[PDB]
Design a protein around this ligand. Structure first.
Ligand code: ZN
Ligand code: ZN
Lengths: 196, 92, 117, 77, 98, 49
């Protein structure tokens, strides 16, 4: 905000320092809290480490054990089965998953040799994307009047325009270059005046 | 964590034995070493910003100026709020 | 003069009782935190929500004390005239000069930097 | 792909007939390329089928007069 | 100034003024007279939990087994491109002065 | 009464001292340099004072 934001506007920065969107919903998703929460759930970008409570690295048999937070796993709408499927698709190689509990499993790495590669595999696994639109770091559901609006910490106009239930004629952004590329130059100058 | 009684290097588990790679020592005792890291999700839940108080006048509401979700309900009939981060006064 | 910003003894007694009530509320918040019965605010941890509750309570205490001090002061002294007409001063200045300063803060937080705990 | 002319940030665009554009440039005392430019690849320029050498008449919303009219010259790129 | 870092690899690296790169903790410890892994581990700490975190650093220096090898490793950075008898003395006279 | 680091390490290794014994001992620093180990550091500070 303030003078740095004004300088950002007048210097024509390609990407803002803090991107932001305001997302409106269609009439059938407009006045339901559960549907808005579902949309916010399925548009927010989530990694594996966002639902893992503890990570255990075993040197004796080259196994990595993952423990999942039940509350976070429910909040993100993620299940352990799809996490296993996502990990199976990775480049890791010949692995072997075994359940240790109803909320835990271990990757046994029947091939790896050293500890450097074991750790590299560990941070490769922890950074794997589970769901969400790229660029969206956090989504917040806000009640303005009788309507529910989604406030986003990131910016992706093309991605959000393809999401179901989004009102594409009312979507807002503070990224003027995306608005120029998608909507044209007159919309861009209207947005510039509004921002200033 | 164990060390070789002769070479002094650390011993790694191979099968049922712990073997020193430099001297070839072996033993019948097995000790398991793991490295456990914890991840905290105290403030990672999904926020729903309805101007409803939790304790006292502290409500959850998005500030139009800075964007923080902390507010003080100054007056209920006017829906008047005040940001706790930048002191901005607004209506929601 | 210096009697324009001096309140009687009953106003001071009322302010003292209000301060005691606010301190009792803060103590109740602290006890609830210690017993694990304190609910957090979304997006913030516990021991960060307790600070918000304490700050809210202390701000309300300052506002109430300022209201009492204004009530038990002459509405036609020169400081009040300078304030209401818009010449110099505000109501926060009168509250701080006549009732209490309130909570001091550094970057939005209470004063914490010092020794250990 | 997607229709964007109905967005609330997009004003109305209209291709201007050659006689009207000629009258406009004569009564302004300018050459066509002295107006603000619009690209032929602009998302709204393609929606109406605008070719370079045309003049687009744009109607925007105003807080002082209600409606305001502006002209742009279509360039290549 | 002497700087000590810990990376995402769980390895500790030492870096001071007169050497351009980062030297592993066990390599620089072997050049100071700590030859075995047990000596380094028990010099760091007595707590098993603390010393279980030195395993990634120990294996990064498994090749180096003596003080002279560590001094050669340091001299490869300090004085590269000369015989393997002045590198050792150059590393010795840098590690004793800076 | 402060026992040095080398003495403690030799006691653990050369003799059969328990490591858990010295995990409950205080650490003593002098001008930021670790000096040794002491059993009850509170009364050491009291007697220094
Ligand atoms: Zn050995
Ligand atoms: Zn604010």
């Amino acid at each position: 905000l303030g003078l740095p934001r004004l300088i950002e506007i007048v210097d024509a920065r390609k990407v803002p320092s803090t991107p932001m969107m305001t997302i409106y919903l269609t009439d059938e998703y407009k006045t339901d809290k559960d549907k808005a929460l579902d949309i916010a759930r399925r548009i927010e970008y989530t990694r594996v480490e966002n639902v893992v409570s503890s990570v255990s690295v075993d040197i004796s048999n080259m196994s990595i054990t993952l423990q999942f937070d039940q509350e976070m796993l429910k909040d993100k709408g993620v299940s352990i089965e799809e996490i296993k499927k996502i990990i199976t698709k990775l480049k890791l190689g010949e692995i072997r998953i075994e359940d240790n509990d109803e909320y835990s499993f271990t990757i046994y790495f029947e091939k790896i040799d050293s500890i450097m590669a074991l750790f590299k595999m560990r941070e490769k696994i922890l950074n794997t994307k589970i769901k969400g639109v790229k660029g969206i770091k956090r989504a917040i559901v806000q009640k303005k009047g009788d309507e529910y609006v989604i406030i986003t910490d990131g910016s992706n106009l093309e991605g959000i325009m393809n999401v179901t239930g989004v009102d594409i004629n009312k979507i807002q952004t503070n990224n003027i270059h995306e608005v120029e590329e998608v909507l044209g130059i007159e919309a861009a100058r209207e947005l510039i005046s509004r921002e200033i | 964590m164990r060390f070789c009684p002769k070479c002094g290097s650390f011993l790694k588990v191979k099968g049922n034995k712990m073997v020193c790679s430099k001297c070839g020592y072996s033993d019948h005792d097995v000790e398991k070493v793991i490295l456990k890291e914890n991840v905290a999700h105290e403030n990672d839940k999904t926020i729903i910003a309805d101007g409803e108080t939790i304790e006292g006048r502290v409500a959850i509401s998005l500030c139009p100026r800075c964007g923080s979700v902390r507010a003080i309900l100054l007056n209920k009939k006017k829906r008047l709020y005040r940001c706790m981060t930048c002191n901005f006064v607004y209506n929601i | 003069t210096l009697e324009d910003i001096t309140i009687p003894d009953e106003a001071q007694n009322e302010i003292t009782t209000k301060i005691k009530e606010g301190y009792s509320q803060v103590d109740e918040y602290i006890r609830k935190f210690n017993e694990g019965q304190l609910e957090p605010i979304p997006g913030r941890t516990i021991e960060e929500s307790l600070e918000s509750y304490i700050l809210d309570t202390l701000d309300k205490l300052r506002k109430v004390a300022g209201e009492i001090a204004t009530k038990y002061l002459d509405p036609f002294n020169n400081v009040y005239i300078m304030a209401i007409t818009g010449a110099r001063g505000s109501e926060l200045n009168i509250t701080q000069m006549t009732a209490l300063l309130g909570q001091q803060s550094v970057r939005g937080e209470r004063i914490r930097r010092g020794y250990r705990e | 792909k997607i229709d964007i002319s109905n967005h609330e940030l997009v004003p109305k665009h209209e291709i201007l007939q050659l006689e009207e554009a000629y009258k406009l440039v004569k009564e302004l005392g300018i050459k066509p390329e002295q107006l603000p430019w619009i690209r032929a690849s602009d998302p709204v320029a393609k929606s109406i089928g605008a070719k370079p050498g045309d003049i687009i008449k744009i109607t925007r919303k105003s807080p002082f007069t209600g409606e305001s009219v502006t002209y742009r010259y279509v360039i290549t790129g | 100034q002497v700087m000590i870092e810990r990376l995402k690899d769980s390895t500790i690296q030492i870096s001071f003024a007169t050497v351009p790169g980062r030297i592993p903790f066990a390599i620089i410890m072997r050049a100071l007279g700590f030859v075995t892994d047990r000596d380094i581990v028990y010099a760091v700490s007595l707590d098993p939990q603390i010393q279980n975190e030195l395993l990634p650093s120990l294996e990064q220096a498994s090749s180096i087994t003596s003080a002279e090898e560590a001094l050669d490793f340091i001299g490869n950075r300090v004085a590269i491109g000369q015989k393997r008898e002045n590198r050792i003395q150059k590393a010795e006279q840098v590690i004793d002065k800076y | 009464g402060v026992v040095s680091v080398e003495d403690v390490i030799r006691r653990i290794s050369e003799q059969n001292e328990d490591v858990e014994k010295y995990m409950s001992w205080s650490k003593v620093y002098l001008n930021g340099r670790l000096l040794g180990y002491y059993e009850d550091g509170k009364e050491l500070a009291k007697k220094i004072r």
